[PDB]
């Protein structure tokens, strides 16, 4: 919603500045996006009168004219504007006068002549974009007067935003009623006198859906001429409301609209057939909008008809032919009431959003018709000239809406607020917004008035009551409640724990979009359908991320463009699957994810330049998996992924439950992309590791320990976890440590074997081993591995 | 193409995680469960004189918890505390109502035992406000319990003494043997100790508490000896990772 | 549960998360869960007012359907970005930076 | 990242007062995100949010 | 239940946590240890020559009755006690109060909060893609960058 400011305070003119007022617009809960002036800033341009105009003897397309402004002598004026001609009235920029862009006016020569000033277009004082020519003002234009004082050019146009409810602020009287309020001043209203018709023409109107328009005025102006000129009073308080001027018929509707609130629509009364039938539209039944498109509508679309053909959608738009033409003669104004609820919807449903659907939907007063179609009616003929038939009312009192009686408890007002206003304040602060007030035990009876379509409960109430009093004179005070502690769980892994420790071993949070390229992500997961998005931003995030692996790709090479070649970056977040078993057909599960490139650190004096491998982002994940306290039950198991090279890729298991995957991305992936080089991914199912095991203290040897080495040559493809878990699963009692620090294949083993060098920790909390049990267990150990893996010691 | 195919079972290359001190896992967990109610952590120094380890907790000279104490002295007016609520005294002396403040730290006492050292650490809370009650003490201690061991477990309180709370109570948790177990130590704050500070008793009343960190460390993860906890064991404390 | 709570709790919060005792102004404003409704300004060094909070007493009807009575319960609810509090709160100047993630940018909040 | 610094102060700073973190999934229904927030389909925020639809 | 106000406390984002510096310690492969605060004066004048310590008249033993001047007598005992313990490898650190005498300090004796720690042995333990390798000063010292680093002023650190 814009206006003009002067406009405004000719219906409330409160004794405080431009800035103090647009405050105070925000301060009711009318946020003031800006505030603009509606003209250029200049000085010494004043009216003038073109008193003699001739061709320039030396120009083709110039004028030479003798201009009076109310000077001791006429002025010498060049102008080349197609419309100067001997007659007109002018805005005038004499010597002296600097316009936008200190735009300094001289004497001067044009192509030979003189010129002592300048006649002046709107665009050239920055009033608006017209520079087909020169202002020309009313005939009786005041000669001697600066126009910033005639066309009053010392005003703001004020934008604010209006949230759905104070549907009764999208115009004029709505809010200058609330300014009005908030100073505690009484609302200057214009004196609107009904016309009173001169004819007895009429058509016959019929409402078939009276719940969707309970009141439907119509009246015939007979005779009018559509191509008479707006006058600039009307032209410059519909500019600085930001609408352009057209037509003299709809720049009056418009001019309505902006000052009462009230949508109006003129038809065509030669293309009526038989009446006017306001009805649902047909299922299918189709209209040509002004726009020249087509709409498709549905039964629920409320539209205006005739006898043969639908003509507008009722409250949203017009159509095409039955709107008003350069030819057309006669006009029936409409202005009716739509119930929103009816009219919500419709508009956004064909890609439309107008001044008329924007009231409408949200709730015009039902007692302004009448205002409304007098004030078209007058200010129609005034200007096009014409005669008024009668005013069509079909009114259904039954569906029109009801003026809510709200009771006002002064225990809720208390408690909701926390803050006691004053009995007279409340019953003052209903009042001057339109509630009819009557006092009661402790408590108020309110009837909204008729504007409001926000005043329904007696919450509503307290907020009028609390915002005309004032947010900021209601004090501060804490909240007074239990102070109870809440459930913990020591199992509980914190992912903010967890991130730190990614942190502390050179990864870097990111947060990449929730929906990414498709195009992109059928390179990681082929043949993998995902949750697309009807109507997205765009294609390139169209698709909800399968996995995290897309995002955290795109961002490594989005730096590497940028000469960073060594990224190890994590990121948290849902993925979306597919999943019919799923709520609402789509799983979301948090992840997290990471990837690492580049060398292993930066180059250092003493750190060698080595590229990361796999084992460098799982040992990351070992340690991540190692704050559970569950990593001798993790399973790192060979397997396959589109994605991952198939021989340096794993499916991370805790305990049998597969909870990630792991691996260096597959070559032609990496040549896809246009990675740098070879580049490690994982990505984990949070919530799967989220626990960790409570520590329980088990008892320490004071006795000394035991190591045992043994060389395991097995096959190559048994891995070597597997070897370990059954040497710590075989010794439970004695064997209280496993580790394998050597693996070696070449000379000295067979082709596709390999010797695994475990060391064996043997320790009794009771008693010193010697060496006929230190044996006999490191025996036990070995045949368990024979038994299972088929090895040998060496 | 190439078949570069590793063993992924193999152990990856890191660093071992190292871990906290069972005694400061508690601390933290605690530590925790009262940030939530609002209460701040503060700390002070270890080496107190007599004024704020005993005359402003209500305990004077001819005192018998002053002598008879097993307090580390080092002459005639410092010490190593026995209470860490020397910074309780001097928060309260810098501001009013209300307060919330749990003060963890260590503490001395000169007795070594099997149950006891010369060392460890305590935790005590305190809050003053306009009607705190005993009833206040109850609930919250309750609640502390009840997440600190994370079961519905029987507790009771029992009328004790401490000079700077009246009425003082002890509580016990119903141990895994069928007897009672002390766990803390608690009372409403004595109206001398908020004289003292400058805090009106008719207007304001508090509760304080106080705990052995070691003790419930041992309680919770069912430690037996208490020399484990400052032996520092490398496999003692790796358990607690 | 009052508006003067939500006042002083909202207040609170932002005098903490700027770390500093700034000037601070609650306006009208419309949210469909809440009634009243409010919104918050912070004093920018601009000179302008900036928007960083909306809010306002819980509806009495999310109650209800929630299974909570507003006869005997009260409430308020608020909002906030946590984009535009991040660039008020460390200077950051464009908000695309967030999601660009270049390390160059992600490295300056270590 | 800046945007989890400034989430992890705030829910540090109301932790204190009592407030517990809960989190949901983001693909929601149209009831959680409308009709349960005083949000029918007939209401303007189903379309100010310039809501994603999938359906 | 407790009836008070719900006002947040005092916050300072430029506070750098101790347990966010014990954490990366723990990250960087050490494991908190907590020692006597009053430790051997024949073992720490081996440590600290020269510097006298604040005695106990009556304590425990002497083997425990100088205040430490420093978290690094009990660190070092607390090695030797698991190297007897067929335990080389010890990464440890502590967080705990030194005790200087100061005659400008509060009660003449200034109580400082100390961060301290100690490395020995190989970097890791026996990996079969790790060669054996014991630690040196720019181990240490770079577990110490990384801590340093926390506060965003390592730019402003000499060695
Ligand atoms: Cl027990
Ligand atoms: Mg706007
Ligand atoms: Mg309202
Ligand atoms: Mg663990
Ligand atoms: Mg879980
Ligand atoms: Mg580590
Ligand atoms: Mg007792
Ligand atoms: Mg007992
Ligand atoms: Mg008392
Ligand atoms: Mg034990
Ligand atoms: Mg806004
Ligand atoms: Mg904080």
Known sequence: ?794 | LAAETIDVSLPGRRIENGGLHPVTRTIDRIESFFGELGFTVATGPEIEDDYHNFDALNIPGHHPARADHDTFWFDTTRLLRTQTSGVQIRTMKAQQPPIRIIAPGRVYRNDYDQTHTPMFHQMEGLIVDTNISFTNLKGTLHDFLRNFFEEDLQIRFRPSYFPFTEPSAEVDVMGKNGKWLEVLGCGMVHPNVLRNVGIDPEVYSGFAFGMGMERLTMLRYGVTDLRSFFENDLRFLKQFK
């Open chain 1, 1 to 794: 919603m814009k206006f003009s400011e002067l406009w405004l305070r000719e219906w409330v003119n409160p004794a405080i500045d431009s800035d103090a007022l647009a405050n105070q617009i925000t301060m009711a809960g009318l946020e003031v996006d800006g505030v603009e002036p509606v003209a250029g800033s200049f000085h010494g341009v004043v009216v003038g009168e073109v008193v003699e105009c001739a061709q320039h003897p030396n120009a083709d397309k110039l004028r030479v004219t003798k201009v009076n402004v109310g000077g001791d002598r006429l002025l010498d004026i060049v102008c080349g504007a197609p419309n100067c001609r001997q007659g007109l009235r002018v805005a005038v920029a004499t010597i002296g006068a600097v316009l936008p862009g200190d735009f300094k006016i001289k004497a001067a020569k044009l192509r030979g002549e003189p010129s002592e000033g300048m006649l002046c277009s709107f665009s050239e004082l920055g009033i608006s974009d017209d520079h087909s020519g020169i202002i020309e003002l009313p005939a009786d234009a005041p000669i001697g007067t600066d126009i910033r004082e005639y066309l009053k050019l010392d005003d703001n146009t004020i934008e604010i935003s209006v949230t759905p409810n104070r549907a009764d602020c999208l115009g004029i009287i709505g809010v200058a009623r609330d300014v009005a309020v908030l100073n505690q001043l009484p609302l200057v209203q214009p004196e609107i006198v009904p016309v009173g018709a001169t004819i007895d023409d009429t058509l016959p109107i019929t409402v078939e859906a009276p719940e969707a328009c309970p009141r439907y005025l119509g009246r015939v102006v007979k005779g009018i001429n559509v191509k008479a000129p707006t006058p600039l009073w009307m032209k410059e308080k519909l500019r600085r409301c930001g609408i352009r001027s057209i037509d003299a018929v709809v720049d009056v509707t418009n001019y309505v609209l902006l000052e009462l609130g009230q949508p109006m629509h003129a038809f065509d009364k030669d293309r009526i057939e038989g009446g006017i039938v306001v009805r649902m539209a047909k299922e299918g039944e189709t209209l040509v909008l002004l726009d020249g498109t087509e709409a498709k509508l549905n039964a629920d679309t409320l539209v205006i008809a005739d006898h043969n053909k639908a003509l507008a959608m009722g409250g949203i738009f017009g159509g095409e032919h039955s709107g008003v033409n350069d030819e057309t003669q006669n006009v029936l104004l409409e202005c009716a009431f739509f119930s929103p609820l009816s009219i919500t919807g419709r508009a956004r449903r064909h890609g439309l959003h107008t001044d008329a659907s924007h009231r409408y939907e949200r709730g015009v007063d039902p007692a302004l018709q009448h205002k409304a179609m007098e004030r078209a009616t007058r200010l129609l003929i005034d200007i096009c000239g014409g005669e008024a038939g009668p005013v069509i009312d079909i009114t259904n009192e039954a569906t029109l809406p009801k003026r809510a009686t709200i009771t006002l408890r002064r225990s809720k007002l208390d408690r909701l607020i926390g803050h006691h206003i004053a009995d007279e304040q409340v019953t003052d602060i209903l009042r001057r917004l339109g509630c009819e007030v009557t006092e009661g035990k402790d408590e108020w009876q309110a009837v909204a008035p008729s504007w409001r379509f926000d005043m329904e409960i007696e919450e509503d109430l307290v907020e009028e009551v609390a915002r005309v009093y004032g947010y900021n004179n209601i004090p501060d005070e804490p909240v007074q409640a239990s102070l109870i502690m809440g459930t913990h769980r020591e199992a509980d892994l914190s992912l903010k724990r967890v991130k730190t420790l990614l942190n502390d071993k050179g990864y870097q949070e990111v947060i990449t979009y929730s929906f990414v390229d498709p195009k992109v992500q059928q390179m990681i997961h082929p043949g993998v359908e995902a949750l697309l998005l009807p109507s997205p931003i765009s294609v390139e995030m169209s698709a909800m991320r399968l996995s995290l692996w897309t995002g955290l790709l795109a961002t490594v090479v989005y730096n590497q463009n940028r000469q960073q070649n060594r990224v190890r970056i994590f990121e948290s977040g849902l993925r979306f699957v597919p999943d019919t078993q799923a709520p609402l057909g789509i799983r979301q599960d948090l992840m997290l994810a990471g990837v690492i490139c580049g060398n292993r650190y930066e180059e250092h004096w003493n750190l060698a330049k080595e590229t990361v491998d796999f084992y460098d982002l799982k040992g990351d994940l070992e340690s991540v998996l190692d704050l559970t306290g569950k990593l001798n039950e993790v399973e790192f198991r060979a397997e396959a992924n589109p994605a991952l090279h198939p021989g340096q890729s794993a499916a991370i298991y805790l305990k049998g439950e597969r909870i990630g995957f792991v691996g260096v991305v597959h070559p032609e992936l990496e040549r896809k992309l246009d990675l740098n080089g070879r580049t490690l991914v994982f990505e984990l199912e949070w919530n799967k590791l989220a626990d960790r095991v409570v520590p329980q203290a088990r008892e320490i040897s004071r006795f000394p320990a035991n190591r045992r080495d043994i060389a395991v040559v097995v096959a190559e493809n048994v891995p070597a976890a597997d070897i370990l878990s059954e040497c710590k699963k075989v010794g439970v009692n004695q064997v209280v440590g496993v580790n394998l620090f050597d693996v070696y294949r070449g000379k000295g083993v067979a082709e596709g074997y390999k010797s695994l060098a475990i060391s064996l920790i043997l320790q009794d909390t009771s008693r010193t081993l010697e060496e006929e049990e230190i044996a006999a267990t490191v025996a036990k150990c070995v045949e368990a591995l024979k038994e299972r893996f088929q090895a040998s010691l060496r």
